[PDB]
């Protein structure tokens, strides 16, 4: 299946005193493998997965050097943006950045990305063709003109199609024991009487990986959304994910309902029906 590598960066200004809070995390698919927190004592890029600990000293020194350079750019950006939007220096603001690459099922470059946000809203993003920019407003337009003249897209395209893909493949191999393994959801159903004539059926999907999944309820072979509830997919905390979907039904009619589970770790979708 396809795979991806992504880096997330968040910088929060602190007008009261000192420098912005900077936090960066790296991910391969749904597995975090590195992080950097300006508030931490190491002041170094740190491992968050066993398979990346294999990397030698030159790796960590290079990554640390580069991530620090990123925080400084963000620090500068927070100031530049404050001016563009003509904002006070007393309020705290946020700059976020995300970039990375995807490899298709053929393990070749599929797509790349590089987007930026200010105070939780799109600011500027590299288009899919990795040659043009999408600017949300006139502040972002000035940035766009500057990056076009400096040919920033060309430099990024080189990384996204080359370096990015090359390292993603390296990580996929080094951590193949987990990164290239799918964990099928473990499923079961619970029953809870809410009244003398009504009962709730909850369909559970546990300890699965990756996070992508679909849970659907059917009544007599027909999809049902009325009287149902599905919670957002949530992390179990051990690297896997969880989710459930519930439906309220007439006591005694539980057998008409079936829960359908689709996940790439499943050869065919699962179908559950209450006892």
């Amino acid at each position: 299946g396809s795979h991806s590598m992504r880096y997330f960066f968040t910088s929060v200004s602190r007008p009261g005193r000192g420098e912005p809070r900077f936090i960066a995390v790296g991910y391969v698919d749904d597995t975090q493998f590195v992080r950097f927190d300006s508030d931490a004592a190491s002041q170094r890029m740190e491992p968050r997965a066993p398979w990346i600990e294999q990397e030698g000293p030159e790796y960590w020194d290079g990554e640390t050097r580069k991530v620090k350079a990123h925080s400084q750019t963000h620090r500068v950006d927070l100031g530049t943006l404050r001016g563009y939007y003509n904002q006070s220096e007393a309020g705290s603001h946020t700059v976020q950045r995300m970039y990375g690459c995807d490899v298709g099922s053929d393990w070749r470059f599929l797509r790349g990305y590089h987007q930026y946000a200010y105070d939780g809203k799109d600011y500027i993003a590299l288009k899919e063709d990795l040659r043009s920019w999408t600017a949300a407003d006139m502040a972002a337009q000035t940035t766009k003109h500057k990056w076009e003249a400096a040919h920033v897209a060309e430099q990024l395209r080189a990384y996204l199609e080359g370096t990015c893909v090359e390292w993603l493949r390296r990580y996929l191999e080094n951590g193949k024991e987990t990164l290239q393994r799918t964990d099928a959801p473990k499923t079961h159903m619970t029953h809870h009487a809410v009244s003398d004539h009504e009962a709730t059926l909850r369909c559970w999907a546990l300890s699965f990986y990756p996070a992508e999944i679909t849970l659907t309820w059917q009544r007599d072979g027909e999809d049902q959304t009325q009287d149902t509830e599905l919670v957002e997919t949530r992390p179990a905390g051990d690297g896997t994910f969880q989710k459930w979907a519930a439906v309220v039904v007439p006591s005694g009619q539980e057998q008409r309902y079936t829960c359908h589970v689709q996940h790439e770790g499943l050869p065919k979708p699962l179908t559950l029906r209450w006892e």
Binding site: T73, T80, T143, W147, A150, T163
Partner: peptide, 9 residues
């Protein structure tokens, strides 16, 4: 592996 150069806004 992180990108090398980072252009400012």
């Amino acid at each position: 592996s992180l990108y090398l150069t980072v252009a400012t806004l």
